[PDB]
Design an enzyme around this catalytic site. Structure first.
Site, PDB file in Angstrom:
ATOM      1  N   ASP B   8       2.370   0.829 -21.074  1.00  0.00           N
ATOM      2  CA  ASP B   8       1.893   0.266 -19.794  1.00  0.00           C
ATOM      3  C   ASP B   8       0.364   0.316 -19.790  1.00  0.00           C
ATOM      4  OD1 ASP B   8       1.082   0.266 -16.772  1.00  0.00           O
ATOM      5  OD2 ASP B   8       3.261   0.071 -16.541  1.00  0.00           O
ATOM      6  N   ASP B   9      -0.259  -0.695 -19.200  1.00  0.00           N
ATOM      7  CA  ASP B   9      -1.734  -0.809 -19.168  1.00  0.00           C
ATOM      8  C   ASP B   9      -2.438   0.119 -18.161  1.00  0.00           C
ATOM      9  OD1 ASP B   9      -0.114  -2.780 -17.825  1.00  0.00           O
ATOM     10  OD2 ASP B   9      -1.934  -3.810 -17.118  1.00  0.00           O
ATOM     11  N   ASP B  52       6.185  -2.098 -20.096  1.00  0.00           N
ATOM     12  CA  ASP B  52       5.624  -3.019 -19.068  1.00  0.00           C
ATOM     13  C   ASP B  52       5.632  -4.445 -19.605  1.00  0.00           C
ATOM     14  OD1 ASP B  52       4.504  -3.488 -16.518  1.00  0.00           O
ATOM     15  OD2 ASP B  52       2.416  -3.636 -17.364  1.00  0.00           O
ATOM     16  N   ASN B 334      52.602  17.140 -69.210  1.00  0.00           N
ATOM     17  CA  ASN B 334      53.147  16.886 -67.882  1.00  0.00           C
ATOM     18  C   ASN B 334      54.352  17.778 -67.608  1.00  0.00           C
ATOM     19  OD1 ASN B 334      51.280  14.927 -66.941  1.00  0.00           O
ATOM     20  ND2 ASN B 334      52.454  13.263 -67.878  1.00  0.00           N
ATOM     21  N   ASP B 343      46.325  15.211 -65.154  1.00  0.00           N
ATOM     22  CA  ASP B 343      45.202  14.430 -64.648  1.00  0.00           C
ATOM     23  C   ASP B 343      43.877  15.105 -64.947  1.00  0.00           C
ATOM     24  OD1 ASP B 343      47.210  12.792 -63.699  1.00  0.00           O
ATOM     25  OD2 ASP B 343      46.943  13.340 -61.584  1.00  0.00           O
ATOM     26  N   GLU B 369      48.185   6.885 -71.201  1.00  0.00           N
ATOM     27  CA  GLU B 369      47.579   7.926 -72.021  1.00  0.00           C
ATOM     28  C   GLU B 369      46.709   7.328 -73.141  1.00  0.00           C
ATOM     29  OE1 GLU B 369      49.892   9.879 -74.874  1.00  0.00           O
ATOM     30  OE2 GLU B 369      51.216   8.164 -75.336  1.00  0.00           O
TER      31      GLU B 369
HETATM   32  N1  LIG Z   1      49.658  13.072 -65.344  1.00  0.00           N
HETATM   33  C1  LIG Z   1      49.664  11.772 -65.639  1.00  0.00           C
HETATM   34  N2  LIG Z   1      50.562  11.284 -66.567  1.00  0.00           N
HETATM   35  C2  LIG Z   1      50.599   9.956 -66.898  1.00  0.00           C
HETATM   36  C3  LIG Z   1      49.726   9.060 -66.288  1.00  0.00           C
HETATM   37  N3  LIG Z   1      49.986   7.825 -66.807  1.00  0.00           N
HETATM   38  C4  LIG Z   1      50.996   7.923 -67.719  1.00  0.00           C
HETATM   39  N4  LIG Z   1      51.378   9.246 -67.796  1.00  0.00           N
HETATM   40  C5  LIG Z   1      52.460   9.892 -68.590  1.00  0.00           C
HETATM   41  O1  LIG Z   1      52.172  10.248 -69.923  1.00  0.00           O
HETATM   42  C6  LIG Z   1      53.423  10.590 -70.507  1.00  0.00           C
HETATM   43  C7  LIG Z   1      53.337  10.448 -72.021  1.00  0.00           C
HETATM   44  O2  LIG Z   1      54.605  10.385 -72.658  1.00  0.00           O
HETATM   45  P1  LIG Z   1      54.670   9.759 -74.155  1.00  0.00           P
HETATM   46  O3  LIG Z   1      55.921  10.161 -74.912  1.00  0.00           O
HETATM   47  S1  LIG Z   1      54.494   8.059 -74.014  1.00  0.00           S
HETATM   48  O4  LIG Z   1      53.297  10.259 -74.858  1.00  0.00           O
HETATM   49  P2  LIG Z   1      53.124  11.447 -75.931  1.00  0.00           P
HETATM   50  O5  LIG Z   1      51.655  11.782 -75.954  1.00  0.00           O
HETATM   51  O6  LIG Z   1      53.953  12.654 -75.548  1.00  0.00           O
HETATM   52  O7  LIG Z   1      53.570  10.784 -77.341  1.00  0.00           O
HETATM   53  P3  LIG Z   1      52.857  11.030 -78.775  1.00  0.00           P
HETATM   54  O8  LIG Z   1      52.994  12.493 -79.146  1.00  0.00           O
HETATM   55  O9  LIG Z   1      51.400  10.691 -78.827  1.00  0.00           O
HETATM   56  O10 LIG Z   1      53.496  10.099 -79.772  1.00  0.00           O
HETATM   57  C8  LIG Z   1      54.469   9.687 -69.850  1.00  0.00           C
HETATM   58  O11 LIG Z   1      55.586  10.453 -69.454  1.00  0.00           O
HETATM   59  C9  LIG Z   1      53.731   9.052 -68.678  1.00  0.00           C
HETATM   60  O12 LIG Z   1      54.450   9.108 -67.468  1.00  0.00           O
HETATM   61  C10 LIG Z   1      48.822   9.563 -65.343  1.00  0.00           C
HETATM   62  O13 LIG Z   1      48.034   8.824 -64.773  1.00  0.00           O
HETATM   63  N5  LIG Z   1      48.793  10.905 -65.010  1.00  0.00           N
HETATM   64  F1  BEF Z   2       2.527  -4.601 -15.434  1.00  0.00           F
HETATM   65 BE1  BEF Z   2       4.007  -4.512 -15.430  1.00  0.00          BE
HETATM   66  F2  BEF Z   2       4.561  -5.872 -15.725  1.00  0.00           F
HETATM   67  F3  BEF Z   2       4.455  -4.041 -14.086  1.00  0.00           F
HETATM   68 MG   LIG Z   3      50.686  10.051 -76.878  1.00  0.00          MG
HETATM   69 MG   LIG Z   4       0.597  -4.043 -16.205  1.00  0.00          MG
HETATM   70 MG   LIG Z   5      51.026   6.029 -75.727  1.00  0.00          MG
END
Ligand SMILES: Nc1nc2c(ncn2[C@@H]2O[C@H](CO[P@@](=O)(S)OP(=O)(O)OP(=O)(O)O)[C@@H](O)[C@H]2O)c(=O)[nH]1
Ligand code: BEF
Ligand SMILES: [Mg+2]
Ligand SMILES: [Mg+2]
Ligand SMILES: [Mg+2]
Ligand SMILES: Nc1nc2c(ncn2[C@@H]2O[C@H]3COP(=O)(O)O[C@H]4[C@@H](O)[C@H](n5cnc6c(=O)[nH]c(N)nc65)O[C@@H]4COP(=O)(O)O[C@H]3[C@H]2O)c(=O)[nH]1
Ligand SMILES: Nc1nc2c(ncn2[C@@H]2O[C@H]3COP(=O)(O)O[C@H]4[C@@H](O)[C@H](n5cnc6c(=O)[nH]c(N)nc65)O[C@H]4COP(=O)(O)O[C@H]3[C@H]2O)c(=O)[nH]1
Ligand SMILES: Nc1nc2c(ncn2[C@@H]2O[C@H]3COP(=O)(O)O[C@H]4[C@@H](O)[C@H](n5cnc6c(=O)[nH]c(N)nc65)O[C@H]4COP(=O)(O)O[C@H]3[C@H]2O)c(=O)[nH]1
Ligand SMILES: Nc1nc2c(ncn2[C@@H]2O[C@H]3COP(=O)(O)O[C@H]4[C@@H](O)[C@H](n5cnc6c(=O)[nH]c(N)nc65)O[C@H]4COP(=O)(O)O[C@H]3[C@H]2O)c(=O)[nH]1
Ligand SMILES: Nc1nc2c(ncn2[C@@H]2O[C@H](CO[P@@](=O)(S)OP(=O)(O)OP(=O)(O)O)[C@@H](O)[C@H]2O)c(=O)[nH]1
Ligand code: BEF
Ligand SMILES: [Cl-]
Ligand SMILES: [Mg+2]
Ligand SMILES: [Mg+2]
Lengths: 454, 459
Positions: B8-9, B52, B334, B343, B369
């Site tokens: 304001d002025d 103002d 697993n 995981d 895997e």
């Molecule tokens: N925890 C987890 N397990 C997974 C996922 N994606 C796939 N798998 C699993 O990895 C498992 C691997 O089984 P395989 O027999 S195919 O693989 P292996 O590693 O035991 O076979 P090799 O010994 O290499 O011949 C499967 O049962 C799948 O369900 C995953 O995102 N998280």
């Molecule tokens: F100077 Be303000 F517009 F009241």
């Molecule tokens: Mg494997």
């Molecule tokens: Mg004013």
């Molecule tokens: Mg495999």
């Protein structure tokens, strides 16, 4: 403005409170015992719970302990309202997790002040919970959904009463990291630093604790910092003020150290929860690799790759070049045809760029109207050819716009840059690039300029 | 609780307002003309500006237009406070972007109610802006809000008065899509649906517009939905109540149709601003390209890149190699320790792969895997070297598991492959890598096996 669940074993109590709260325009629901109460909370997720302690069967301390032990409900402020008034039972209620403990007959002016305060605080928590929950058809990790204690914590004590301060410091000393500071001006500084909670004396003799708190709240840096205020239990007007300016919680002089301990823990544990949320939000954005609008890579991803490639360059490996492209008169486009059309241009430009450059190259979105292309294993002279090629391609052909309905001519200016050996750095490389764009601009636009090593 | 810039002025005006506001515990700063005002707003980012209109040189409407035209300051609520009172002055002030237009000598009760309201709203918005500016600074979010867009906008008119409802609808009709609804119970439902703004009648005869608003505000779905309330102008207490329960803005009856238009636009672009922020923040973790669990690139992305690289290879350019890695006995992991630990192993394996390979390489999640690494400008021999190095990084050291408690040994088998000749294709390249893997596993696992392409004697 808030959903409030009220719990009491006596109908008279439930409906008296209910009429008071609906007269202030709140949405009230009711329960008549513990079991019911816990069912409603889990289902309906109210904003606040007002809770009797003495009830047949499950009592209010237990109910309270269970609400805080479920993650669905842990976040809801609980206020115990009871006929009991022993110090013993006061402290049992606060230790079981309640925000406040009120003894019948209650002060309505304080109840509403307190409710208005809690709802104000829940605004930011709830928004962040909403933000996270929009990662849920995505990927979470790491977090094991596991709480987060209230112990640890650096506590600043702003007080000009030496006797009182040391007592407060001695009590917190066992479980926390307390520091005393009787100068408010210095305290303003300290409070910016590594601090979890401030304790401020509102009845200080040499400064106004409430004005000091207002100060912290007004500056953006410390608006979130929890503050617990020591006040006179006979000065109601001042307690309400304290809540209104933004105090998280209140304590009566003389300071009961068991009450003190309970409320400090409560406040530190809520402040930690909300920093878990903020960091989770920021960790998920870190993991993003593409630019939402254009689907090119984002600049975060790009600068990471550029770091690795430039390091390898400097120690004797392949050279790297960068193109920095900035669209000409892009503001005039938005000012004439509108933002939507601006986005049509950006999207089309990204697809043209991607498909006139090799797979091994990294095209990316660098800023609003700026694009960067990183070219591995490429030197200055070749990069200038590539820049030329892109320039002529862009301007050699108009852009489709207004979904089909209209063409537009667009031109770009490009700065070009290559690595320069052991001393060079990615920030240096990019800086040379935008010095090129700058001269290209100055030369009359629709131009390519390569600025050289020094 | 808020930083307020007062402009304001006349020193007497600035001084009197300042006292009132600091008595309510606000941090006040001051300017006495336009130029100064704009410098202070850009340097200090105050929470609210009180302004103002009539000042020597640049006047308040201009100062206001400039504040909304600069993205640093566009989001700050401006309240005009002026001796002027013509309806023309009012409409220009609102049209230039002000949240409110007050006449001197002001109502203090009302000023505080309004300030208290603006700051309650700013809490959400500025947590949002703060997160989102963190996203811009770390290099993920990029772009700009529209600067215009307060037109279009689906507007719900909850009103008891046929005729007034109809006039409100006629005025909005040109620039927005209005809908009338005299039933409050139905209106609760409609308000949930596709709606940008609700206009409610606080002086309705058959229901309480303020109770109806409190209703919207209490339910979590519609708590952000902007609400503009029509109020009787001789009921200061009800006006304050309205602001207290959560009304975004007030409009005095009898409705001035251009006041209406200006205040609706303001609210609708404020709504869209907070939407644009929420989208930047959320929609940015959506669009595949990477694999959620590991962070590496997904399969679709990888095969796209491999197509381009292999084509260029076949027509005379740089050669390309592939590693196909598959974890051994992953099913045993697993089945003995559970999927939480499975995981943990995948995530860590991804970290060890990513960091033992060059930036220019493309490591990616190929199956459950299985992993693939694409290596541009790399031939069979060097690829075998790389495969061996990676292999020993996984087996040379045990994996942390059960968040910190337990140590696991893990081994991988790898097949290796490289482009060869004009007639090669990405599917052929990957298929050779599979034959590698199959041999590696037959040979006893924890092994690397490369596979060259071959033609028959009379091919
Ligand atoms: N925890 C987890 N397990 C997974 C996922 N994606 C796939 N798998 C699993 O990895 C498992 C691997 O089984 P395989 O027999 S195919 O693989 P292996 O590693 O035991 O076979 P090799 O010994 O290499 O011949 C499967 O049962 C799948 O369900 C995953 O995102 N998280
Ligand atoms: F100077 Be303000 F517009 F009241
Ligand atoms: Mg494997
Ligand atoms: Mg004013
Ligand atoms: Mg495999
Ligand atoms: N795409 C890709 N290619 C790879 C990778 N690892 C090796 N190569 C290729 O294989 C070659 C030989 O690797 P080396 O036998 O380890 O011989 C290596 C190694 O002894 C050393 N060296 C180079 N870079 C590094 C490094 O980053 N770390 C370490 N520890 N040594 C390195 O000098 C090297 C010879 O360098 P180059 O001329 O580049 O020759 C390298 C490179 O062409 C990789 O992870 N990705
Ligand atoms: N990273 C990257 N580098 C690039 C790009 N464009 C050019 N270069 C580099 O500089 C080159 C010389 O480009 P040129 O003059 O068009 O000379 C070109 C061109 O005449 C022809 N050529 C190669 N690939 C293509 C192509 O994909 N399309 C067309 N139309 N011609 C190509 O043969 C080339 C000579 O081949 P090179 O030995 O590869 O030499 C190439 C390459 O090293 C690019 O988009 N990305
Ligand atoms: N003038 C010139 N332009 C370049 C050069 N490098 C890339 N480009 C441009 O961008 C290309 C797409 O690159 P690509 O993804 O490697 O995909 C490339 C590549 O995989 C292959 N290709 C085409 N010509 C050659 C060639 O002369 N040598 C090799 N090795 N591959 C080629 O097909 C391409 C797609 O065909 P295009 O329509 O030419 O599309 C070409 C071309 O428009 C270059 O050195 N010079
Ligand atoms: N020009 C050149 N640059 C070097 C050399 N040594 C290290 N660097 C630089 O610093 C590296 C990181 O060091 P590292 O611990 O060996 O980490 C290395 C190493 O563990 C492995 N690696 C990459 N290439 C090779 C290689 O050729 N041989 C071996 N043995 N390992 C490699 O992965 C790496 C991470 O790769 P980068 O992302 O490229 O990151 C590389 C690279 O930017 C070198 O001899 N010549
Ligand atoms: N539609 C749209 N516009 C954007 C975006 N990101 C930034 N912008 C706008 O790009 C504008 C850039 O205007 P400049 O004046 S800085 O750039 P010019 O291209 O007009 O300047 P030169 O002619 O190149 O010197 C800014 O005002 C932004 O609002 C965006 O994501 N979508
Ligand atoms: F029954 Be309550 F504890 F007053
Ligand atoms: Cl081969
Ligand atoms: Mg009882
Ligand atoms: Mg530009």
């Amino acid at each position: 403005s808030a959903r409030i669940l009220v719990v009491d074993d006596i109908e008279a109590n439930v409906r008296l409170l209910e009429a008071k709260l609906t007269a202030e325009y709140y949405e009230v629901s009711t329960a008549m015992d513990g079991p019911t109460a816990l069912a409603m909370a889990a289902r309906d997720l109210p904003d606040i719970i007002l809770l009797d302690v003495m009830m047949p069967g499950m009592d209010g301390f237990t109910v309270c302990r269970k609400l805080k032990d479920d993650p669905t409900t842990r976040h809801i402020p609980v206020v115990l309202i009871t006929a009991l008034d022993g110090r013993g039972d006061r402290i049992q209620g606060l230790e079981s997790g309640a925000s406040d403990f009120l003894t019948k007959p209650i002060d309505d002016v304080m109840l509403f002040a307190r409710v208005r305060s809690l709802t104000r605080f829940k605004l930011v928590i709830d928004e962040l919970r909403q933000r996270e929950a929009s990662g849920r058809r995505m990927g979470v990790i790491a977090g094991a959904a596991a709480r987060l204690d209230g112990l640890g914590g650096r506590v600043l004590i702003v007080d000009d009463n030496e006797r009182q301060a040391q007592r407060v410091a001695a009590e917190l000393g066992v479980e926390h990291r307390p520091v005393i500071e009787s100068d408010p001006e210095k305290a303003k500084i300290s409070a910016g630093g590594p601090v979890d909670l401030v304790i401020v004396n509102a009845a200080a003799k040499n400064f106004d604790g409430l004005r000091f708190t207002a100060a912290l709240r007004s500056e953006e840096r410390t608006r979130q910092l929890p503050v617990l205020a020591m006040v006179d239990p006979d000065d109601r007007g001042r307690m309400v003020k304290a809540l209104e300016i933004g105090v998280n919680d209140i304590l009566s002089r003389p300071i009961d150290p068991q009450e003190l301990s309970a409320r400090v823990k409560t406040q530190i544990q809520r402040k930690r929860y909300t920093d878990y949320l903020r960091n989770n939000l920021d960790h998920s954005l870190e993991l993003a690799v593409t630019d939402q609008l254009t689907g090119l890579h984002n600049r975060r991803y790009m600068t990471g790759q550029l770091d690795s490639l430039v390091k390898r360059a400097t120690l004797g490996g392949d050279p790297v070049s960068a193109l920095l492209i900035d669209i000409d008169f892009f503001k005039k486009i938005n000012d004439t045809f509108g933002h939507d059309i601006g986005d049509e241009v950006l999207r089309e430009f990204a697809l043209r760029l991607a498909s006139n450059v090799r797979a091994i190259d990294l095209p990316c979105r660098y800023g609003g109207e700026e694009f960067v292309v990183i070219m591995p294993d490429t030197a200055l002279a070749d990069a200038l050819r590539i820049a030329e090629r892109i320039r002529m391609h862009v301007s050699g052909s108009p852009f489709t716009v207004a979904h089909g309905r209209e063409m537009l001519n667009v031109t770009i200016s490009i700065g070009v840059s290559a690595t320069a050996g052991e001393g060079d750095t990615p920030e240096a490389l990019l800086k040379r690039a935008d010095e090129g764009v700058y001269q290209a601009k100055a030369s009359g636009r629709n131009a390519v300029v390569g600025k050289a090593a020094h």
